[PDB]
Design a protein around this ligand. Structure first.
Ligand SMILES: C[C@@H]1O[C@@H](O[C@@H]2[C@@H](O[C@H]3O[C@H](CO)[C@H](O)[C@H](O)[C@H]3O)[C@@H](O)[C@@H](CO)O[C@@H]2O)[C@@H](O)[C@H](O)[C@@H]1O
Ligand SMILES: OC[C@H]1O[C@H](O)[C@H](O)[C@@H](O)[C@H]1O
Ligand SMILES: OC[C@H]1O[C@H](O)[C@H](O)[C@@H](O)[C@H]1O
Ligand SMILES: C[C@@H]1O[C@@H](O)[C@@H](O)[C@H](O)[C@@H]1O
Lengths: 309, 309
C-alpha cells in the first residue's frame, strides 16, 4: 500500500555468516525440534528490524569478551571483569539477558586472550577457554572466568580481549556430548533465573519444521559436537535492522531460486518474529546450488500451506 | 535516466566491520599518503558491485586458511596445502592475485590452527603464526607455512583451519616496525610479481586526502603496529555487490550526517572504483557522533570541490 517493500538479501548461504558464532554458513538443515526448547538469544531479530535477546549487529563481536583480568592464585585461571565494546564500565541494569553477543549455548569455547599495555604498547596472547556452563560464568553480573596457558603473563588493569575460535569436549567422556547448542547458559549463575529472553520458537503448522542456517564450529580438543544452527544469518539481522520494513502479515513467503535453471527449488515461511519454517518431516541436509538465493514473494498468513520441501 | 538508485548502508561506523581483518571498525582517519602506496586487496569493490583484488563477501573468511598440513621435521612448522572455503581443491589459475580473503599486508598474524580427524571426530588446536613476508608464504601457489606450538599433534590428510586473531612483532627490534599494512605480500613468493591486482589509490585533487575506515588489531606478542585501515567497510562491499547500482558519474557525493542535531558534519567523495576522499590536510582522527551515518546525495565528478572537512 506504499509500505516499504520487504526484502531479504540476495547473498547466497556461503556468502553469509552464522549469527551465533563468527564463522561462515555452510548449509541449510531441517529437523524435528519438538522434544526440546529452541531459544537462542543471538541471531534474533524481527523482520521489521527489532533486535531481540542478546543480538547485536557485528558478525565479529559474537562470543567475544572484553575487560580487565585478575589472576586466580594457584591456578592458570583468570577472572575477567567485563567492560563494554567501547571499553567503558559494564552496566548490569539494562533490560537484556546478558551483554549483547554473549554466548547463547553451554559449551567450552576456546580462543585467544590478548592484551595490550597502554604505556608501552607491549602485547601478549594466550590460548584460553571459557566454560559457559561453569559456576563462574556470570556475564550478566559482569564477570566470567578463563582457563589459560599462563600463571603470570597477564597484567592487571589493562584492556584484554577474548577472540573465540571453536569448541572443546572432555575426551574421557562420551563423544559429542558437549557443547549443547540448545541449552542456554545461566547468565547470572546457577541460582538466578535468566531474564529478558527472546522467546522460544517452534513450528505450529502441521508438517512443518524449522529451517536452520548451519555451520560447523572448529573443534580444538576432544570429541565435540560442532554443529551450530542459527535462525537467521547475521546479514539478515543487519538487513532488517536497516530496512525496517513493516510486516504486512504474520509470514513472509520466500522462494529459494536456482539461477542455473530459473526454477524455484523450495519455498518457506519467514515468520515476522524472525525464524523460518519448511514443510518437511525428518532430518535433512538440504542440497542447494552455490548460486541459489532466497527471494521474498508475498505476505501470507501463518496458516498457508507450503509445497513440500 | 533509469539507473537503479545508488545508496550506502545506514549503519554507523561503529556498527560495521573492517574489510581487511575480522574486527569491528572503530573510527575514521585521514592522513597524507604520499609516503606509501595504498593498494590493499581486501575491501575492494566498485560502487556498482564488482569485487576487486582478493575481495570476497564474508566478514569471517578474511585472513583465514583451510587445507591440510605436513610437518616440517626439526621444527614446529607445518606447511598447509590450501583448499577452498567449502573444502574443495584450490585452483591456482583463477585470475585473482591469491585466494579470496588472503591477507593483503606483510606481517605476522597469530591465531589458532585447528583440525578434525574425519574417522572419529577427534579434534585439536594450537597457537600458530603465519609470516606473510616470508619466503614460504605462497598462497597463490597453494601453499603457506605456519609456525605452531607443536611438533607432533597435527595429522596429515585431515581438514585443518587457521583462524586469525591478531598480530605480533619481534620485541628485540624497533617498536611498531611491523606489521606493514601498506606492503603487499608476494603472493607467489620471493621476487615473483603479483597478478590481477586491484589498483593503487590516491587523492587526485588539491587539498584532498584518503578517508580510511580504521581498526586496531589485537596484538599477541611484542610491540606491533596495530593500526589497520580499509577503504570500504565490509558491509559496504556486501551492499554494493547486491545492489549493483550503476555509477552515473565518477564520484558519488556523500554527506555524513548527525541525526542528533540534524546537521551535516562533512561531505566526501566516494569514487566509483571504491574509495573515499575528503578535503583535509594533515593526520586527523575524526571525531564523530556515535549515531552519525553516511548518506548518498548526488552524482558529481572528479572536478567537484568539497567543502573543507
Ligand atoms: C582427542 C584428543 O584431544 C586433544 O588432546 C587433548 C589433550 O590436550 C593436550 O595435549 C594434546 C597433545 O596430546 C595437545 O597438546 C593439546 O593442545 C593439549 O591441551 C588433553 O587436553 C586431554 C586431557 O583430557 O584431552 C585431550 O586428549 C588433541 O590435542 C589430540 O590430538 C586428540 O584429538
Ligand atoms: O617475556 C615473557 C613471555 O615469554 C614468552 C612467552 O611466550 C610468554 O608466555 C611470556 O612468558
Ligand atoms: O623473542 C620471543 C619473545 O617475544 C616476546 O618477548 C614474548 O613475550 C615472549 O613470549 C617470546 O616469544
Ligand atoms: C613484549 C613481550 O611480548 C611477549 C609477551 O608474552 C610479554 O608479556 C611481553 O609483552
Amino acid at each position: 500500500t506504499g509500505s516499504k517493500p520487504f526484502t531479504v538479501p540476495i547473498l547466497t548461504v556461503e556468502e553469509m555468516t552464522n549469527s551465533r558464532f563468527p564463522i561462515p554458513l555452510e548449509k541449510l538443515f531441517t529437523g524435528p525440534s519438538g522434544a526440546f526448547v529452541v531459544q537462542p538469544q543471538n541471531g534474533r531479530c524481527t523482520t521489521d528490524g527489532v533486535l531481540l535477546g542478546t543480538t547485536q549487529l557485528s558478525p565479529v563481536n559474537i562470543c567475544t569478551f572484553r575487560g580487565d583480568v585478575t589472576h586466580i592464585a594457584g591456578s592458570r585461571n583468570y577472572t575477567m571483569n567485563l567492560a563494554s565494546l567501547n571499553w567503558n564500565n559494564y552496566d548490569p541494569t539494562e533490560e537484556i539477558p546478558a551483554p549483547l553477543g554473549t554466548p547463547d549455548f553451554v559449551g567450552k569455547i576456546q580462543g585467544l586472550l590478548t592484551q595490550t599495555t597502554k604505556g608501552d604498547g607491549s602485547t601478549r596472547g594466550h590460548k584460553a577457554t571459557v566454560y559457559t556452563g561453569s559456576a563462574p560464568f556470570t556475564p550478566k553480573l559482569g564477570s566470567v572466568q578463563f582457563s589459560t596457558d599462563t600463571e603470570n603473563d597477564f597484567e592487571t588493569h589493562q584492556n584484554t580481549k577474548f577472540t573465540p575460535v571453536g569448541v572443546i569436549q572432555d575426551g574421557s567422556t562420551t563423544h559429542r556430548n558437549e557443547p549443547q547448542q540448545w541449552v542456554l547458559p545461566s547468565y547470572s549463575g546457577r541460582n538466578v533465573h535468566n531474564v529478558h529472553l527472546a522467546p522460544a520458537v517452534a513450528p505450529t503448522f502441521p508438517g512443518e519444521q524449522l529451517l536452520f542456517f548451519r555451520s560447523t564450529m572448529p573443534g580444538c580438543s576432544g570429541y565435540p559436537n560442532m554443529d551450530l544452527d542459527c535462525l537467521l544469518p547475521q546479514e539478515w539481522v543487519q538487513h532488517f535492522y536497516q530496512e525496517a520494513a513493516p510486516a504486512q502479515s504474520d509470514v513472509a513467503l520466500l522462494r529459494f531460486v536456482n539461477p542455473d535453471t530459473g526454477r524455484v527449488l523450495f519455498e518457506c515461511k519467514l515468520h515476522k518474529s524472525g525464524y523460518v519454517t519448511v514443510a518437511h518431516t525428518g532430518q535433512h541436509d538440504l542440497v542447494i546450488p552455490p548460486n541459489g538465493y532466497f527471494r521474498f514473494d508475498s505476505w501470507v498468513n501463518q496458516f498457508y500451506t507450503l509445497a513440500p520441501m
